[PDB]
């Protein structure tokens, strides 16, 4: 019915933040894990 | 600082939901995009 004190947009905010942050870790984790394999691998 | 009228746990909730949902799409999108490449490729 009524509204809280000063609820701007926490719900939605957290939503976009979670998806981004979560993706930041996973994404980087992938690019990092792979890089660990590349270490000046000579091949003639 | 304080809490709204009666908000159980929307903030945190949305957080976990976003990361999961967002991950669901991205994850599947990857497994799907790749599958599009595999079309019963015979190799003897």
UniProtKB/Swiss-Prot annotation, chains A, B:
Isoform JM-A CYT-1 and isoform JM-A CYT-2 are processed by ADAM17. Proteolytic processing in response to ligand or 12-O-tetradecanoylphorbol-13-acetate stimulation results in the production of 120 kDa soluble receptor forms and intermediate membrane-anchored 80 kDa fragments (m80HER4), which are further processed by a presenilin-dependent gamma-secretase to release a cytoplasmic intracellular domain (E4ICD; E4ICD1/s80Cyt1 or E4ICD2/s80Cyt2, depending on the isoform). Belongs to the protein kinase superfamily. Tyr protein kinase family. EGF receptor subfamily. Changing residue 34 to A: Abolishes proteolytic processing and nuclear localization. It is linked to Amyotrophic lateral sclerosis 19: A neurodegenerative disorder affecting upper motor neurons in the brain and lower motor neurons in the brain stem and spinal cord, resulting in fatal paralysis. Sensory abnormalities are absent. The pathologic hallmarks of the disease include pallor of the corticospinal tract due to loss of motor neurons, presence of ubiquitin-positive inclusions within surviving motor neurons, and deposition of pathologic aggregates. The etiology of amyotrophic lateral sclerosis is likely to be multifactorial, involving both genetic and environmental factors. The chain holds residues 642 to 685 of 1308 of the full protein. Expressed at highest levels in brain, heart, kidney, in addition to skeletal muscle, parathyroid, cerebellum, pituitary, spleen, testis and breast. Lower levels in thymus, lung, salivary gland, and pancreas. Isoform JM-A CYT-1 and isoform JM-B CYT-1 are expressed in cerebellum, but only the isoform JM-B is expressed in the heart. Changing residue 5 to C: Constitutively activated kinase. A motif (Nuclear localization signal) lies at residues 35-43. The chain crosses the membrane at residues 11-34. Tyrosine-protein kinase that plays an essential role as cell surface receptor for neuregulins and EGF family members and regulates development of the heart, the central nervous system and the mammary gland, gene transcription, cell proliferation, differentiation, migration and apoptosis. Required for normal cardiac muscle differentiation during embryonic development, and for postnatal cardiomyocyte proliferation. Required for normal development of the embryonic central nervous system, especially for normal neural crest cell migration and normal axon guidance. Monomer in the absence of bound ligand. Homodimer or heterodimer with another ERBB family member upon ligand binding, thus forming heterotetramers. Interacts with EGFR and ERBB2. Interacts with CBFA2T3. Interacts with DLG2 (via its PDZ domain), DLG3 (via its PDZ domain), DLG4 (via its PDZ domain) and SNTB2 (via its PDZ domain). Interacts with MUC1. Interacts (via its PPxy motifs) with WWOX. Interacts (via the PPxY motif 3 of isoform JM-A CYT-2) with YAP1 (via the WW domain 1 of isoform 1). Interacts (isoform JM-A CYT-1 and isoform JM-B CYT-1) with WWP1. It comes from the Eukaryota. It is found in: Cell membrane. This is Receptor tyrosine-protein kinase erbB-4.
